[PDB]
Amino acid sequence: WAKPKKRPKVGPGFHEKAQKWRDEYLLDRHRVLADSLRAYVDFSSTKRVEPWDTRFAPFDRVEKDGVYILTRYLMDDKLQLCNYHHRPVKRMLCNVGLMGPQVTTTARWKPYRFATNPANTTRAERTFTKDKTVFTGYHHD
Amino acid sequence: SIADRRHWPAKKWSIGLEPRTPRDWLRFSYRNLAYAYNGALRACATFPEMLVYYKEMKQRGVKVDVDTLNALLSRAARYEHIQV
Amino acid sequence: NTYLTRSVATPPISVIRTGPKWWAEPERMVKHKVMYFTMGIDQLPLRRTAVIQKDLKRFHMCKPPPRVGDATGYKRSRGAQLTTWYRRIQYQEYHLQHLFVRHMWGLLRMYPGNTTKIQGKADDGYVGYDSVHFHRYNRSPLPFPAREIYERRK
Amino acid sequence: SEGKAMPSFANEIAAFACRMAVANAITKLLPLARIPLKKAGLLSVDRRREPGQFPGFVDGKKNKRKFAKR
Amino acid sequence: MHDANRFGGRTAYLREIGPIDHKKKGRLFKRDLPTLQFNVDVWCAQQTLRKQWKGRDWDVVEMPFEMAPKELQRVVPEKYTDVPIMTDPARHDYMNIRRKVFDREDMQDALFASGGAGQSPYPAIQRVDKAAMTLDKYL
Amino acid sequence: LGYTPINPDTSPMLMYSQCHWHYNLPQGMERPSSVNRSLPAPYQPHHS
Amino acid sequence: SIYFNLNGILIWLNVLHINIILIKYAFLILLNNLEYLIIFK
Amino acid sequence: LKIAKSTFGFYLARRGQRKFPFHRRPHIKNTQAMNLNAPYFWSYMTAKSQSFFLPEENYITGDWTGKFFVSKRQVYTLQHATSGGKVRVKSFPSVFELNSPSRWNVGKEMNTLTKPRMDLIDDQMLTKKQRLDYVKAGLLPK
Amino acid sequence: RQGYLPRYTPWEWIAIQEADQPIIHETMRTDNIGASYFFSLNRSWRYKARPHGYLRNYENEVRDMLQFVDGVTPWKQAQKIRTYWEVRQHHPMPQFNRPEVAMHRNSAGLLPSHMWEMDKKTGKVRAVKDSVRDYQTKIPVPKWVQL
Amino acid sequence: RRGKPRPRAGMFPEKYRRVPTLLKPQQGGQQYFNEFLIRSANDA
Amino acid sequence: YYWSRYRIPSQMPKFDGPAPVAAPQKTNEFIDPIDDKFPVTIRGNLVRPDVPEDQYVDSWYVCTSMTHHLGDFRPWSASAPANAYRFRPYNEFDSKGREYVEHLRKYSRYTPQASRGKGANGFPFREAFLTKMNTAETAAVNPTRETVMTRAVAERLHHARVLSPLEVQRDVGRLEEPLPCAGKIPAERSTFPFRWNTEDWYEYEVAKARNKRFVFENTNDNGVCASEVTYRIVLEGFWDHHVMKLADDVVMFLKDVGRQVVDEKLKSVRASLESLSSGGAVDPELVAAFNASLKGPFGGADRYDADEVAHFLRSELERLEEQCVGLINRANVPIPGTSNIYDANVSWPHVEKMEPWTRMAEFWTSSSDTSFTELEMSTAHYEFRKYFRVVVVKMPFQSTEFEQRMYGIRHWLHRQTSCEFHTTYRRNVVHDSAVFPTEHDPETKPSHEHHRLFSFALDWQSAPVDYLSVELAREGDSWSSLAKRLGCSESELKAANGAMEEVVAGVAVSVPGSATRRLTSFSTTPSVLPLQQGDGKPAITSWRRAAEVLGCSVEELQQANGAAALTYMAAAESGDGAFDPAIKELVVPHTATAASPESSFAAFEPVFEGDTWTSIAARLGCSEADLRACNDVDGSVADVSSCASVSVPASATRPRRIIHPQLRPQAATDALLARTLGEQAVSAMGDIPSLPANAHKFPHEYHTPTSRFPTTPQQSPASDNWIAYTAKYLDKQLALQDEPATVYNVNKLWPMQQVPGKVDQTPFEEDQTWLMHPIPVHQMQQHHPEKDLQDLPFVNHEQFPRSLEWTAP
RNA sequence: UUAUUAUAUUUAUUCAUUUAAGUCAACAAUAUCUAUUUACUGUUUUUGACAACAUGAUAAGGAUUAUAAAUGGUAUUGCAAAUUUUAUAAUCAAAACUAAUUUAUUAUAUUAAAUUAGCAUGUUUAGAUAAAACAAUAAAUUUAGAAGGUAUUGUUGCCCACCAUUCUUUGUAAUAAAGACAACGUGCAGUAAUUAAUGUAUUUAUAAAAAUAUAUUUUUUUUUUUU
């Protein structure tokens, strides 16, 4: 046995540093909450980059033809309403059922944090530099 | 409890030795005994003793072989006092 | 190619050595057979490699031939030059399999994985949807979305 | 399939078990077919056994844990 | 392992991407196996359940006993509750009754006794003439 | 071998020692115990 | 108390082993850990 | 333990970096009590349904002389935030109170309210050895 | 002493052992009357047909529990137990969708923007004002609650 | 951990000491011997 | 002393010797020095004598093998009959060869009877039966055009016979050994091989696993497994050789008591038959029970003479003899020379094996804190075990004198071996329709609303339903008039009430058991008690006079009248302005109310299309002349879909109840929930919300426990199929709004019977729909109602160690 | 390197968790001949198993005894049977890391019910380093059999000089000699001992000592009877 050796006292008057610290931290807890909550919500209201991966069929087909037709006409206003998040569109797109089962099997989709980039995310440096002040679990923007 | 523990000796016969254990049944078969006998028949010098094997190998069903036919019949002619 | 995430490379011998585990995986060499077969390309190196493994797999159980003392060492030398040949036979085939496939994707328009070169369509390394700012080796900040090398229509 | 039933038997370690099972079968049907089979080993049985589970090895089969020196 | 091209992509539910700090980041249930293992057992069961339910060419329709097909005009023991019941041994008809499907055109009698112009549900079955001469008979 | 005593009803080293049966022996019944039927006691309960 | 002849007694107290033999193959191999471990045979 | 941080150091042994089964780790160390994932702010470390009834510790069973502190599973309500009286939760070193009330605290159990691993560490509580290890860490540099 | 251990317990010791212990009166299993469907299972609370196992089994007892909890409890006292959503009605952001399904459904209208303050340069929340003083809600306890 | 070097191959037991001696090497194709002795007896 | 046993009785051997030859002079002592250096070529690879393995018992604490025979060894000869090839019980096949030839012979006799009543044994060969089920591929592919050619060229053209491989003389020497005696067996596609159907193969293998228990052994047969009672005794000892030698003992015990006890009854049976041996001389009581039946076998109402009764009896003893003497015979077969207990045909009783119980208990052999690998690497597996043997005794009759020989076996069992008995005795049960009446449906069919949680607690008076057996003769009813309202026969009524020779209005007649129009003993429509005169003109003003006027309990009056109970005595605050009902008109407790043949039975019976006037009365049980009259005779049944039920005739009817009688009435539940139904009227609880207001906007975060995934969306209005959709949105002009679906119900959700009227969801056919729908993954720990006790997969608690194949009889 | 038999051999690496005390004794209620026993009361002198010292005792760890059924050890690892003489420290719900002795899930689909883990994106990239020969598949760059110890459970063994107090003692030579003795510092001189040692001679010097010259073995051995 390393015979269990005592830790000394908690120190004189540290309790006051405790009741203080925990409290005013819990106050900071509000603003980081208030900030991140807004960031989450206002993220949900914005537009995203299109979740599909254009490289793979059936999204290699030119914008004029292919599933872009139904994307442009049968559901166009809808896909803007859903704000192009990768959760609803893949559910909306599956409902129209005019492309069959090629949503999951054939059509390959962007990775997660590549699909939370908002519209007009030109520079690829962006998807990694999302702010650190907000605690969202990478739903924020 | 007496009748069980009797080990009736394997050498009930000539050159073909009886099995008494499951590992010994692996190295034994009525077909292969013909090999042992054809090895003894061709080792017998004269026709008369070559009987006691064939006479025996007919007792327990040791199936004869082609060379069993040769060993007997080849020396069947060469035994002088034979009757045709 | 459905696999696109970043990768890890291993030298030819370090893959050739696995033999029937992955290198001579029966169905794998059947894959690159048909692919060779259908392209009108003769499958000469594959069937050249196929007999190499098939004999090694068949004889992987036995002992090595008894090492009797030979001051000449010709047997030990022949034991080496015949080996390094076999490695050099699979070396060519290992590279050959990677040669056609990346070029094959040039004909099916399948974007290979990261840090991958197709002779004409992606002269330097293609990298799209990686885990980093820049092209891992060329230090070029990636474009978003993943850049495309083929023409859009089918 | 008398043994532990699995969905797909696509592995040689099972094929040999079948290659042997058919080998022993022919012999029982035909007596003198045991000669060309036994000389080629299809009758003989492997005693190879994949190592049973054991907690000590990290994966559980043959690779022990780690230990670093101070 | 969780290479996103595994398990039909549904492995994306179990993946902590990037250089995670094993202590603070990374969900717990993604670590223990049996939970990962029990989960895959869910999804893997779905494909079976999906495929079993994509082959539902038949549609289940109840029917009073009197005018049911003469195949099921006997006691029908429920599934998983008796040795599989071959339909008719004497009639040389050995097919599981749960596997025998009856054609909608065959049964517009009771099921669509409300048919009026009885064809209006469906036209009758055109059964192939298996006897007269045809290419099969070299003619 | 300590303060905690050995449970003589569940220990093999005891039950399968020489001072009791071994698990190999014919394991029959040792001796019939006719207690309640040779000298029986009458029923004097404490609960009335 | 039944009995059948002994072959070797083995007093394995914590101090030591003292293994006597009067060789045979075996039968039941008795055991006692009352205070001193002994392996009758 | 090597350093008996309480009475339960003398008894239980570390047993190395033992891997307990999931959710059966013996000590209930809720060091992840306050990890703010704003989207799941109502589902993380809360009742999995939002129609459960409040836990027992938010209520008073019988005629109590008085609790020194109310337990940390208690959930904070508006009555909590508006009455403003001293509400105490057990923590090291002695106790923590919610002196500055807010409505951002209403609805979340006290587990998610307090910060268990206080960032300000005690150079006083740790011997020269255990402090030294913090110096190498950079958590308590020099 | 001489090894004659009985392969079988002798017939004598069979009778001597089998007569030292009494027959259970219940294992006799005689019944010509039948079963008492109305009364048998409802016998006195001492020797009653005691249900056991899964909670389904306690039919005649759960009814007593309800009749019991109905008895002692005044509804007055039970009113004070609040559901979670009853409490979360007082939170600045009481109900907002989570990312699994209806993330897009959330809107700025759900934001309690007046609670905090925004700074245009940072675009973030610099701080928050006090909500305990100025929260005037007609239902501190919910409406149907009447102490 | 070992912490000592790896031992040689010879000191390790035989790698396939369990597979029966009949299988290493597998004398495959016993069918043909009767075909080959005939054609050989033909030419001779 | 408690220790005076533990001394040693003799003088131990003494130490006067040196170290034995070459022993201690590292060297591990356990290995015999010289004996092991003895070359294996000379002694072999054997370690323990080459005897049948079952002799050896895996020793404990002494890592070797020991013979359960005390140093004696039975050679392999005793393990087989005389001169057995490879020492087998039978020469013909090995273990597997005798395993699968069993079935192939057992299928040759399989007939649909062989399965019924028998459990897993009743199932045929899994393969021979499943391939038969596959008549898709069964179409017998005739030998190909090539084969019939290559043979025809051979057999005729090249003058060469063709021989099948079995018949090929592979022999080099013995080309006179014949082909196997079946060289001409017919090869078909159905029988061999066994290529079977996949989903059916599931249905077989599953139904096999569940029907293991459904063995009905108490039969009336004459076979090796025919019996009236089948006791199974499961001995349990820690050592296999213990339980075997014991399972051998009880056999030669029950073979004794079993032989004698059954023999006395056989001595009785032959006595109960012979020419001047009567005993089955029929009881006047028994000859009544055969003739106690309104309608027998051949013409009308029946009568048996005492003779054929005395024939029916002997018609059965002949079987209780054949089953008896067939037992004594199988009792005397096993001799010490040829004892084989494990075969039912030869021995009685016949011991049945059972898989031993094994519980691996692995643990860290080390104990230290700093290093965990030290612990894990130090794992050692020691197992607990218990070996079972099951004795199966089948008595053709249930003798209690024998059973109490059985339950005394627990005393003299071999040391450390407990036993359990599985008795299985036929029991005669009366299904008296008087208590459980097979009556029509309730007019108001109960629904899923009657089967929520706690429905057993509050929705159903535990069966059997209570029925009134007591009925008061009304003012001027006659015997036919009472038999009318009770729907019973006047003659049956005359027999039922022996004491009632004349009907005096106001006395209660005892309802006959065979009645068909008895009432549910309560009234359903609520009744109120006005403060109208009652007792004198003074009204009710206190709790006791409240009870006195209704003549029921103050308590049960409070139970229903909750609001009046929470305020005052008889709710002293009377009615002003508008009469306060619960105060003024106290609701009589449901218990104080009596039923009425009006409210009980629905007097409205529906009519269907195939109905005729008499056909409806044939269903209702009444006469057409009673029906048509009571219904104001119609020209045809087409107009009225619900003809009123006949005012009950004198004899009987089968009318539907107004409401299911078993259903626990709500008034009683009001009584059970008295206080809470009070505090509604007390504090005026208008309504309490379950979910906040905006819930319907917020679909997910409000997922109540009773709610379940995958969530069912709102149904598309009528898009049940494509025509329904096309006609609705694409082509409005199309005539067929929906193609003609089945008039009878179409449960697409097969086989999951789902509640009707509920918007329901078909399982998703395309994968894309499966992944994208919101389905949770099992993040938290796993829980199951049954095996939550057995906490983990690792720690499997066993309250009782029983063989994992222990089938409760 | 002496005349049935193989190491050269991949697959890995960021890992942590413990709380807020309470042992000084036993008592049938139904259906067997009746006990209120119903509610069987008698007032108080010790200090081991502990928060502390307190003998025993089973593990982890591979290195040279299978060809016709076996790859994990004793020297010892927290709670154990004779050493007591400050002291309650034990799991209970809701609970806070500093810890050597640990598979964590890496991009088609991802939180359903006892409460369970939001920052670490950066070329499956430093140095260190981990574990297989067993129902699988790698069978050779190669092996008994000769050898030493100042230690004396033995290389993590001892020893050695210079470098301080001392003390003692003188035949007083930088900076007396000798002997004693245990510090610190400097190596690592010696035990075939990291270029073998010893000796003698010359020279050299932090210090054991080193270079050159000769003998030498208290160093270990390598061996043509005229080609």
TrEMBL record, chain B:
Highest taxon listed in the record's lineage: Eukaryota
Q: What is this protein called?
A: Excreted/secreted protein 15
* Protein species of origin: Leishmania major
Automatic annotation (TrEMBL), chain C:
The organism's place on the tree of life at top rank: Eukaryota
Return the protein name: Uncharacterized protein
Q: What are the annotated GO cellular component locations?
A: kinetoplast; mitochondrion
Species of origin reads Leishmania major
From TrEMBL, chain E:
Origin, by domain of life? Answer: Eukaryota
For this entry, the protein name equals Uncharacterized protein
Q: Which organism is it from?
A: Leishmania major
Show the taxonomic lineage: Eukaryota, Discoba, Euglenozoa, Kinetoplastea, Metakinetoplastina
TrEMBL record, chain I:
Highest taxon of source: Eukaryota
Name of the protein in question: Uncharacterized protein
Q: From what organism does this protein derive?
A: Leishmania major
The full protein's residues present here are 1031 to 1177 of 1177
